[PDB]
């Protein structure tokens, strides 16, 4: 019932991308919360969210943002929990700025980065699932089924 | 018994991956370090990745330069979380390494870290934070490590 | 009758691009098979496909994929046959990620890479044709005709 | 009392940021130079940026390499103008630094300068031009400095 | 009444982007002028504009241009006033050329550069506002209110 | 009699192309190595490419740096498969070389390999795999070479 | 009457871009020819065109192509005349491949390169005009008028 | 009397621009070489570019690194053809130089050459080919130079 994964994003504009992470966690029945937390516009909200995440029972945080995406990095700065970052595609630079702003974290504060866009949001949720599966047998079985179905469902020839 | 597996495409990757090895040892996390080439020893990778979970591994840290493809293929065969470290390449300075690792299609994740030594160290720290979720002793050591890092940052530069 | 060229792609989404390779081989009457084989979602299917390709009579493999396109490289890892790679255009990075993930193969396992997109798929088929033409006189003549017609058909002035 | 604050993520950034320090001193602009890590000392940054205005600072010059994120987060907490200096990185030569600093979302500005030493010097000059708007003495010194720069450019290269 | 901020752009095509800077200054009630001044097509107009800016009472200049955007740099070359540059998104290179042509100013002549596009235009105006606020108490209070409202208005969850 | 032609724009390309030469010799594949400049000796290239097939060549390996354009123009004149090797350039590290070679328009193919030495070696290996399709003896030597490469990969890095 | 400028392009697809060079030369009343000459598909046609250009009275050649654009460089390889290159925007890489393939000519064989796209085609024609103006007084006056009108026509404020 | 003007932003550009100077002298083309900074000496540039035609110059070769903007602004003030040479920059290896020079808006052309020494040499050769259009003696010298370049290309690399 209590969320074990927190999905946060810099703004409503990131939802089109982050909704894919939400859908995947729901699919695997992983309790989670989905919120908007801006490192740049609501820094104190982020500070509070990140430093109290562990105490609240969260195990993994999935953070998405575009452009000079400082959200994932700053979230990781305040929590000891694993932080996964999703580079949201930006209008001009197609997420290259988002990607470098998230993945190039200096040594000492990590952010596990996924692909730019929807695929990355989906994979952040799957990566979070694989993490939780390490100590949740039931979920591990559901993840195995998910991966197995993915593999078995790939067509043999194009239509 | 190892709970983290550090794999790389060749000896040339060790200069970078040794930083992940050192950090895990520092946090007292048992691990194994191997060379597994996705392109030169594809069957070795298949076997390694396929059996990782049953062998007791919880996290795999894979390093690759250029288009080596090691992290992605490891993730294709294991249900375990796979972290990728882009090893700096001669011509493209790791940009090819980075894109070839992070741009995984939806369905097969690879948590990617920064290009080079920083990425290797952070891959180990990320692995540590994952393991700490269910290992109180490690969680305490990680907390101490993170707190020390914060307390050790100087307040002013040596402007001499 | 038996296929001598195998066209494989990571997913149905790659078909819009790889269909150009299919059309060209058919045009030159080169027997081939067209399949979906995902290195990431169906690794064992790829292992089987690539290691048995030569035994099955295939002479050249054309592999297309986008993003962190590991398909061409892994196919080349399991077969001694020439592997040609087609970088499929990706949404965000326009195939630059596809290109680097295919062309930057470390020494020891080659992948002959073509241009990003439809042009690359067409050229992979033409390159495969030029390879087969080295030991198939009839096909060599048809390829000569194809190249000759291409050259002769270029307009002298724009419309 | 300092009117400009120069902050950077680590001692490694000093090689670049010292150029901003030198220029401010040259123009007789009182300032402070500190190391504040957005990722390693987030609360130190929060406090620094939040209290900058009340402490008398008018402009903040922040340097960062890679994805350090220092300039952006400083700007998030202060109403003061924040100038960012992309510090050259090993692999991507400051391109990651540049994009991570300049591409701020609408609503939270960071005036960004060139990658490296030139950017640090220009950040100080930009800060100087801002302060000169309400400091006649400084305005005169800046005018003299700009005029001297122009008058000092050689007319021909030493072609020997 | 007299303008204290000058917004200049290379051409009418830049207006779609620079209008965001105009709107923000008006919102904060900052007197300003908005003009088209091309460094490449009207060099003498730029020379006159920039060298006389200070005398006319301007305190900050916001310059926007795309491609080989020389406007911001040349404006800064002629004035002692702070010059802020806005990289306008270009058709082919998505503003990467605009960005490098503005931000990479050699030491000695600065241009405070903002993000590519509309966000950059808005932020140039906000940065100009933060500069003027240093010596204008009333404006400083309005800027505080603007920043406070921005922070308070961020939703807590996506729709 | 040569069955593979290795051509390059200048002596400066040899440092890279020599790797293709060495690999072909290792696999006992007769070949010729020449300097042919698309831009400085356009007619030499026209003649070389036009007559390659009648001279007995089966595959051409062309190396070029920057915008040299050698691989593409060779392919324009020959019906033979042409493989391109991007030679690393000083400023753009071979990125200009790579794009100028791989982005051929539909209708005129150039099978492109990696930037630098790895690409040169792989161009030779690719040429070898093409020739092996109709040369049993070579096919056996290639099989042995590939198998040896796989068997020679170390299982663990020298972590000393 | 006889053409003094030759505009050549790799294919009909380049016309949308190169037509801007054609329009400008016509505007300035500069006799010219506009043809399709493909370095890759019609190499011999290019060889003949370029080596005989000077003999035919051409003074400047404007060559446009996209992707691995070898047309400008190869044209310059066969003629002593000044060759100006126009990078045509490519689908995937937005002309970055076109640009590098044209501008990065090794020392010894130059190609004066213009901007990617329509602007580049227009400027190639203007650059050709400025070259011809050096020894054609009447044209020099028309070019002066063209440049003067361009400068005088720039609006002072956006609409 | 000079017919070509070679201008650059600073002494640091000379290492690159000297190649244009040498080539013009080789072809016996009278020219002048000056340092003119678009950003540091804007009025010097205005005067230089504005009066170039009346002073007898037929072509201007301008070199710039980063965002110096010299070629574009020179072209803004002169009706003469302006050729631009991107000088290699420290961090971005001339990519910033290249884009800042070649991406001129329609209406104000700058014929751009390759990044670095090759571009400087080619700018001089391009200027030479322009002048040769109305100078028979020079046309003959250029023809001889181009023919010699072609005849001097070696047929095979020194494979020792």
mmCIF file of C-alpha atoms in Angstrom, chain F residues 6 14 19-21 28-29 31 35-36 43-44 50 53 59 63 68-70 82 88 94 99 117 133 135 140 148 150:
data_model
loop_
_atom_site.group_PDB
_atom_site.id
_atom_site.type_symbol
_atom_site.label_atom_id
_atom_site.label_comp_id
_atom_site.label_asym_id
_atom_site.label_seq_id
_atom_site.Cartn_x
_atom_site.Cartn_y
_atom_site.Cartn_z
ATOM 1 C CA UNK F 6 44.040 -0.985 -50.375
ATOM 2 C CA UNK F 14 49.454 4.740 -43.904
ATOM 3 C CA UNK F 19 46.705 -2.424 -40.153
ATOM 4 C CA UNK F 20 44.558 -3.586 -43.073
ATOM 5 C CA UNK F 21 47.711 -4.542 -44.988
ATOM 6 C CA UNK F 28 47.469 -14.940 -46.907
ATOM 7 C CA UNK F 29 45.295 -12.725 -49.083
ATOM 8 C CA UNK F 31 46.742 -7.526 -52.323
ATOM 9 C CA UNK F 35 48.116 6.046 -52.685
ATOM 10 C CA UNK F 36 45.321 7.506 -54.813
ATOM 11 C CA UNK F 43 41.913 10.886 -63.055
ATOM 12 C CA UNK F 44 44.200 8.382 -61.349
ATOM 13 C CA UNK F 50 37.133 1.763 -63.437
ATOM 14 C CA UNK F 53 37.334 -5.526 -61.753
ATOM 15 C CA UNK F 59 37.276 -5.908 -52.998
ATOM 16 C CA UNK F 63 40.877 5.087 -46.352
ATOM 17 C CA UNK F 68 38.939 13.421 -48.903
ATOM 18 C CA UNK F 69 36.004 11.568 -50.551
ATOM 19 C CA UNK F 70 38.099 8.617 -51.792
ATOM 20 C CA UNK F 82 34.040 -0.887 -51.609
ATOM 21 C CA UNK F 88 41.229 10.055 -37.664
ATOM 22 C CA UNK F 94 37.550 11.436 -37.507
ATOM 23 C CA UNK F 99 30.195 11.137 -41.842
ATOM 24 C CA UNK F 117 43.204 1.445 -36.686
ATOM 25 C CA UNK F 133 32.543 -17.158 -49.446
ATOM 26 C CA UNK F 135 37.632 -19.722 -51.317
ATOM 27 C CA UNK F 140 39.338 -22.325 -43.137
ATOM 28 C CA UNK F 148 41.670 -18.213 -31.945
ATOM 29 C CA UNK F 150 37.699 -16.020 -29.106
#
